């Protein structure tokens, strides 16, 4: 369980993206999750469509609300297309999955990490990236243009992102905003403080598919 875990230089995460004026956090976080695992075994890095997840997942409320843990489940159940055969537009619409044709990616299950346990988060993040939530409605996290976020912030979780590494002290997160935020679309939050919930409630509820 290395002292350092970066999947970027591991060839697991692709360039950064933006959800835009679309409250669709959840589908983006997922595509990165599934994505990671998909490349971890096969040795093939891919960019899947979040747009599809939006238009297809009726359980989620597309362009403004969702469950990073429906998306995944969805995929495993059905599947998910490339981000070319289903590029992101930013507006929820009619499911094209079927109309689009044969799927391209399809997992083999979804599991959740025991909330409120850093030790647990890491491990999984060590075996493969994960979808995690937190407080973004933040007025500080909103302004982050590079650094180690300690706060201030709260325990009112409401935005989903992704963890793509950690250090002895900083946890790495991929944001669904442009590369005109944090440190090039990236933000480092601090771990090991005692805060069980985890600063910004980053330890509330996390997840991930399964792959054979």
């Amino acid at each position: 369980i290395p002292e350092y875990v970066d999947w970027r230089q591991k060839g697991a995460v692709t360039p950064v993206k933006n959800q835009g004026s679309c409250g669709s956090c959840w589908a983006f976080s997922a595509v990165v999750t599934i994505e990671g695992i998909i490349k971890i075994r096969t040795g093939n890095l891919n960019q899947y469509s979040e747009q599809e997840l939006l238009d297809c997942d009726r359980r989620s409320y597309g362009c403004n609300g969702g469950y990073p843990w429906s998306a995944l489940q969805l995929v495993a159940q059905y599947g998910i297309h490339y981000r070319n055969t289903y590029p992101y537009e930013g507006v929820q619409r009619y499911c094209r999955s079927r109309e689009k044709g044969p799927y391209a990616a399809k997992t083999d299950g979804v599991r959740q990490v025991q909330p409120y346990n850093q030790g647990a988060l890491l491990y999984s993040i060590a075996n493969q990236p994960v979808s995690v939530v937190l407080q973004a409605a933040g007025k500080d996290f909103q302004l982050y243009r590079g650094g180690i976020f300690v706060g201030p912030c709260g325990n009112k979780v409401d935005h989903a992102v992704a963890a793509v590494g950690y250090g002895p002290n900083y946890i790495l997160i991929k944001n669904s905003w442009g590369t005109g935020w944090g440190e090039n679309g990236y933000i480092r939050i601090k771990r090991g403080t005692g805060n069980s919930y985890g600063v910004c409630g980053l330890y509330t509820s996390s997840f991930y598919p399964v792959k054979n």
Partner: peptide
């Protein structure tokens, strides 16, 4: 509630 749903994450936006």
């Amino acid at each position: 509630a749903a994450f936006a």
